[PDB]
Symmetry: none
Subunit: 80 residues, 6 copies
């Protein structure tokens, strides 16, 4: 036999960039405030898996590739 | 036989960059404040796995590739 | 037989850089404050694994490749 | 006799000034280039004169009184 | 006799000024280029004169009194 | 007789000044270049004179009184 199995992954290519951010900002006054008292997630897989709990109270400004990846690739189970 | 198995991974290439960040900012006054009292995640896989708990109370500014990767690739189980 | 198994990994290439950060900032006044009292994650894999608990109360500014990688590649189990 | 001859000249008075030039210029990138291979003037006066040859390949920004004066005042010739 | 001859000249008075030039210019990118290969003037006066050859390949921005004056005043010739 | 001859000259008065030039310039990159291979002027007065040859390949920024004066005042010739 000639069984062929080929999974894949997270191949990335950005290129160029020069994002320069935020420049030339005369006088501002950022006075943010964050205060949380909840958001308790959970997850209870039994047979299969790759649950992904996630909590945040951030400001969430993303420039390039701010992912929170979590991979689980090409699993198997026979129990012969 | 000629069985061929080929998984993949996290191949990355950025290129160029020169992100320069944030420049030329006349007088500002950042006075942020963070105070949390919760967000307790969990996860209970039994047979399979690669759960990924994650908690944050940050400000979350990302310039390039701020990932939080977690990989689990090409698992197997026979129990012969 | 000619069985061929080829996993992959985290191949990275940035290139160029010259990120210059944040320059030419006239008088500011950063007065941030962080105070947490919770966020206790957990994880209980039994058969498979590579759970990844993670907690943070940071400010989370990323310039280039601020990942928190955790790999588990090409596992096997026969129990013959 | 009461012959009266009165020539004049280049009397100048500017006053005040405070020209301040060019200020508050965030990041620029001047990349000028000058390359000349000609412009050969000439002049051949015989009896009278005060020819004025002039050549330039400059950028020619003038703030106040950027003249290139050349005077020849109250000439005479009798050959008695 | 009471012969009276009175020539004149280049009397100038500017006053006030405060020209301030060009200010508050966020990021630009001047990339000018000059390249000449000709413009050869000439002039051949014989009896009278005050020819004025002039060549330029500049940018020619003038703020105040960017003249290129050349004077020849009250000439005479008798050949008695 | 009461012959009266009165020439003039280059009387100048600026006053005040405080030109301040060019200030508060965040990061620039001047990369000018000058390269000339010509502009040979000339002048051949015979009887009268005060020719004024002039050559330049400069950038020619003038703040106040950048003249290139050349005077020849109240000449005479009798040959009695």
């Amino acid at each position: 036999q000639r069984v062929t199995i080929s999974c894949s992954g997270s191949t990335s290519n950005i290129g160029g960039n020069t994002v320069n951010w935020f420049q030339h900002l005369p006088g501002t006054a950022p006075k943010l405030l964050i205060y949380s008292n909840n958001q308790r997630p959970s997850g209870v897989p039994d047979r299969f898996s790759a649950s992904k709990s996630g909590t945040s109270a951030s400001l969430a400004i993303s420039g390039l590739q701010s992912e929170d990846e979590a991979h689980y690739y090409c699993a198997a189970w026979d129990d012969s």
